[PDB]
Symmetry: C3
């Protein structure tokens, strides 16, 4: 006997309603097997992978991850793949959970402007990755061609207050992290498994700040978590909380009460969270340079009353979250576009630098630039800064140590180098500082910084 042996499809054919991340379709709420028609369209298009950083994504349904599909174990799924006429590449699909060679791949090969279809029975309950399976497959996956299909058990999943859709991926750009412009895919980095970005939902900040997930104290939250890869395994973790349950794919095993759990490349899990105290809870890859240096952070923000008996402390801030502990960094996008257009103003730079200063510089120098007398020197009304703006460029790029005097007080400490900041970022941060806190104004350009980087002091 095969699994999912619930008889022939009954009722009427159902046209599946698919959702865009981070949302999920409603529970199927059905006690009979059905014929479910799924229509998914591939679109190739530029989107912002980071502020001022464009990338040509290849998408299922216009998003990364692709549209979420929700069916019932025992359903017959008639799957239609369309490839938008604007596409340059052929595409196809392999749905994990399908019983059949390639998970659908051979019968879903679809050239630009064409459509394909195939039918499969969903024998297997579980959460499953789907992805493109077109040579070169790794390229297609790296460009964003992955999503999730949920095959519900016949009785449905237990009721929760919220369901969300979060999917990790590793990305490979020719340029370095936060280097502006349209970035090509980089095959060499991809083969070496050396991503420049590691993201949830296709972009830096996709699920931070004003794009956070939400719930309230006392509520339950289910998250369908995918790892599209192509290559990385996620040390998937929630900062400041625990997972009530973690279940991989359609596995019989359910782990309970864990905070950190390994999601294979191509894998998927369902996690459950119960909100207990208010604040921001961070989903990360705890291979932690991915989370805090490459973009792999997402936020579940919980509203409600503090409970001092459980936690006396404060909400997260830029010390931990960095520059993602603001609503957004739109000013960076604006400054980058103004640079391209040749219309970059001092204020454009100031606002971009303000965004970028948070965490990156404020951890030591404070959000108001005051520092801590004798420990961290001030950027506010800083004689040392004003005396030599080129020196300040060198300090950001190359660090500073040894005894200095700032505003009449001696410091004898170490500012590490910050060479990974791009020329525009250094320029904008320093322009912000110069135009704040009674400093002398003026500006630093990306070209100024490029020159200092090419010839350290």
């Amino acid at each position: 006997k095969l699994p999912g042996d619930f008889g022939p499809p009954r009722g009427e054919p159902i046209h599946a309603v698919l959702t865009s991340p981070p949302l999920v379709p409603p529970p199927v709420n059905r006690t009979y097997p059905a014929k479910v028609i799924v229509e998914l369209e591939v679109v190739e298009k530029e989107m912002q992978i980071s502020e001022g950083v464009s990338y040509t994504f290849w998408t299922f349904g216009g998003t990364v991850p692709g549209s979420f599909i929700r069916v019932r174990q025992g359903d017959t799924v008639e799957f239609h793949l369309k490839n938008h006429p604007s596409s340059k590449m052929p595409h196809n699909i392999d749905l994990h959970g399908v019983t059949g060679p390639g998970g659908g791949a051979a019968s879903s090969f679809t050239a630009p402007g064409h459509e394909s279809q195939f039918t499969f029975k969903a024998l297997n309950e579980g959460i499953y990755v789907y992805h493109c399976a077109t040579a070169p497959v790794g390229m297609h996956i790296a460009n964003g061609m992955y999503g999730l299909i949920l095959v519900e058990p016949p009785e449905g999943l237990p009721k929760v207050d919220h369901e969300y859709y979060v999917m990790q991926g590793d990305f490979y750009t020719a340029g370095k992290y936060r280097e502006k412009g349209l970035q090509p895919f980089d095959m060499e980095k991809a083969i070496d498994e050396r991503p420049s970005y590691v993201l949830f939902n296709g972009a830096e900040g996709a699920l931070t700040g004003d794009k956070a997930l939400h719930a309230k104290v006392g509520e339950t939250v289910r998250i369908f978590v995918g790892n599209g890869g192509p290559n990385l395994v996620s040390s998937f973790h929630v900062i400041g909380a625990i997972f009530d349950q973690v279940r991989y794919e359609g596995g019989t095993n359910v782990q309970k009460n864990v905070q950190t759990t390994l999601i294979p490349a191509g894998g998927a899990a369902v996690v459950k969270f119960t909100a207990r105290v208010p604040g921001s809870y961070v989903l990360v890859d705890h291979s932690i340079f991915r989370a805090l240096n490459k973009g792999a952070m997402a936020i579940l923000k919980i509203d409600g009353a503090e409970n001092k008996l459980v936690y006396s402390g404060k909400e997260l801030d830029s010390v931990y979250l960095g520059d993602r502990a603001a609503p957004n960094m739109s000013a960076v996008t604006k400054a980058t576009q103004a640079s391209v257009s040749g219309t970059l103003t001092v204020q454009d730079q100031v606002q971009a630098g303000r965004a970028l200063f948070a965490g990156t510089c404020s951890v030591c120098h404070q959000g108001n630039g005051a520092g801590l007398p004798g420990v961290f020197p001030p950027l506010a009304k800083s004689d040392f800064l004003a005396a030599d703006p080129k020196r300040a460029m060198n300090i950001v790029l190359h660090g500073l140590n040894g005894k200095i005097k700032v505003n009449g007080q001696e410091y004898d400490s170490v500012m590490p180098p910050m060479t990974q900041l791009n020329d525009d970022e250094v320029a904008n941060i320093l322009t912000y500082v110069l135009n704040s806190w009674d400093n002398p104004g003026g500006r630093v350009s990306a070209e100024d910084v490029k020159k200092v980087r090419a010839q350290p002091a």
Copy 2:
């Protein structure tokens, strides 16, 4: 009390019969503990890691992975290691599952032309990796010195229709992937965990095409899956199917109904599959550049009747499998040897290029070179190709975009660069194309391509 406390050995001493991958010895089918004599001989020898790519493997029993050993929990194992006189290095063994320092290592040190022996009781049921433990250990493991030992539970494993033996490893050559010739081990790549090949059973294609594993619809298949490493963790997955069961080593835990599962470096698992519909099912490392760019794919081919109610679609093809969706690529081996001998003919190149064209080029240009009018230009009877063979070399290496005219029709699309193809591969593919489909014949040499690669247009 110790585990495996089944009393002294009884009956007669048993001389273990070991098997070469991908086969397994028969079930022990025994209700009493025995003295089991195991004899394993190390052989160092060149073998083909890929077509036309030689490597000096270090082996247990002449194969990678090494010979499979099958005993019963509670057995006393008298283990004899011989090192063939042709060896240059000393060798030894650490069997996971042994209770004792080094898993046998100190007492199994064996110089070329010598033999060692030690005795251990198999206290622990499970599937376990064994490997060489001779300084530099990572080098010995990277050269192929690993295999599996099964310690059966006293009652035996449940009956299945087929048992197979599959073992992943990461390999480190001085040359790049598919660069021909005898490739040395590369210590720097190994320390950095940057393999050039990631393989099942010691070679590209070891378990694809005419070397696939076989079963029939309705049958059960058990696979003993090892990960010799040295360094990688496998996101081990079956495309188009599910694992009924996954059990790691001798663990009490058994996961059921999962498709993707993480196998540690040095780890091993037993998986179970039930054949439901015909076609090819791909075992991969779903860190997917390993599978589709470095060789980490193996096939279980299922024969029997289609069931359109479960899967309406077609068997896998070269779009997904690439150039491994043919029986073999023997023509590549032949062309490489002819190059070495100085006897390379046009036909040698043609046949090699035919093999390599599959997936790599046919995904877009089709297996008959017809392309898709207005979308993918033809290689068949291509005026554009014929007009400038050197341009064609540049297109393969460096890509092509922008408006072109081919056979009277405009194209305005993107062919990505394929710079990872080696000079001989480009040469052979283009010679195949030139000698097909009414194209003008002639040939492209590896030296021609080398020159274009050194000076792009």
Copy 3:
């Protein structure tokens, strides 16, 4: 209802007694919830990461990993973080297991010379990583800012004979492995997840030789195993044994009878071992170049009677353990310091080289330099060595093959290159050999080797 709902704190406030690795505080042995006051002080200081290799660690309590904290589920923990006045950086803490944003991070921000405090209820039993959460977070973690907190179940863990504390981390130095001197942190290696050292407890040899963990035949050993990362996932394994139990964090799942288990970055597990036969049992990351080329090995040494019915073989030696199968390598530290001081003697070099010869050279040439006639040539009273010391430098760096004659006998084999040895290591090893076994004495300097490395023969 919240987990850990055992009522208000009762009894007297308890001042937690924290322990330094590899030791653990006693079981809490308490049946009521308490207010537990924890005081932890950050200290930045140089320590030896390897012999003659200094590193500026950032520590919780002066050690890597940081002091171990032990409380009971349901306790109220008043956590005090002090930052020593000598610090240059601000610091804070995120304790996994805390219910609240950042695991404490925002409320524990502590500038040099300051103190912070916050209160949390331990709702969640389990073993948990704590770490610094100060921008740049990955830098702080990479510098050593991590440890473990145990939250006991209310009834306590089962009694065992020994409890130990072992924590893996990946480290990123500007210099290569075993390159001497004060090594800076290397941000580029860290972002790329390319560590130069992978260690247990903050140093090479921290838990080997005379610093091994101890137990006796018949005893049970519990190890609290952390993985601070920042980036690597451990294929955590015990050579020559098995884990009776493995439990991750506070998970309900317990795996039994496994030898190899994957610990996520930021993860923690409790393992249990039962000593059965005497000898050294090696805890490793079985991504095995980490263990045997980067330092990721620790020893549990078991004393007691051999049991030939279970294991007939010998204790581990330098073939497997390499140069860590001696009590210590103090002579390397001494030679390095003498070099710095300009007082390096021949004997200083000899003793350092003696330490380094073990495994590295003795595997083939034997500990007495005799080799194996006709198979491995002698270093003892070697005419070939004496005839050309510069040739010997080239042989170590670059290898040797082909027919040679040594002490009247022909060899025709292969000595692989050993280019990863540093100039001082080559110099000291060869000085040891030259001053042993009736060889002619004299010395080889690091400068001599530097010259040969820059111009191979």
